């Protein structure tokens, strides 16, 4: 959200796509690394710790690959300029000459 807020001045559509290209990769890398490090506990003999490792790993995989990469940016782009209420924002800047 902070990165999105940073680059919202040159329209909201360009802002969303640039925020994706800039920080989606970072968040996904971190999420995947930790998620699989936690999935390595499945081979553990103890069932409670294997269960916890698998729960957390699957949770982060679902969170990073679906909820956070497709669902929240979609809501932002759909709601458009009403994603920053009560602040007032323009959905796209004044057209510039060619």
Partner 1 sequence: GKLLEPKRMARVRGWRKVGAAIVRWPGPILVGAVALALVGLLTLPGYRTN
Partner 2 sequence: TQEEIIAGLAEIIEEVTGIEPSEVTPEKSFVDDLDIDSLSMVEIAVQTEDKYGVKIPDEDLAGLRTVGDVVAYIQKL
Closer residue to partner 1 in complex, CB, 40/90: 90
Token digits of residue 72: 């929240």
DSSP string computed for 4-38: HHHT-SS-SHHHHHHHIIIIIHHHHHHHHHHHHHH
Q: Which of the choices partner 2, partner 1, none does residue 37 contact, using the CB cut-off of 5 to 8 A by kind?
A: none
- List 7, 17, 34, 84, residue binding partner 2 (CB under 8 A): 17
Total residues contacting partner 1 by CB under 8 A comes to 23
5 lies in the binding site for partner 2 (CB under 8 A): no
93 lies in the binding site for partner 1 (CB under 8 A): no
Considering only residues 32 through 51, tell me which ones interact with partner 1, judged by CB under 8 A: none
Element (H, E) at 39: helix 25-39
């Amino acid at each position: 959200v902070a990165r999105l807020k940073e680059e919202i001045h040159a329209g909201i559509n360009t802002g969303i796509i640039r925020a994706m290209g800039g920080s989606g990769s970072v968040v996904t890398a971190a999420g995947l690394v930790f998620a699989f490090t936690m999935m390595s506990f499945a081979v553990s003999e103890l069932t409670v710790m294997a269960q916890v490792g698998t729960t957390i790993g699957m949770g982060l995989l679902f969170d990073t690959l679906i909820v956070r990469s497709f669902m929240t940016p979609s809501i932002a782009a759909l709601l458009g300029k009403w994603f920053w209420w009560p602040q007032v924002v323009r959905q796209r800047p004044i057209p510039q000459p060619w």
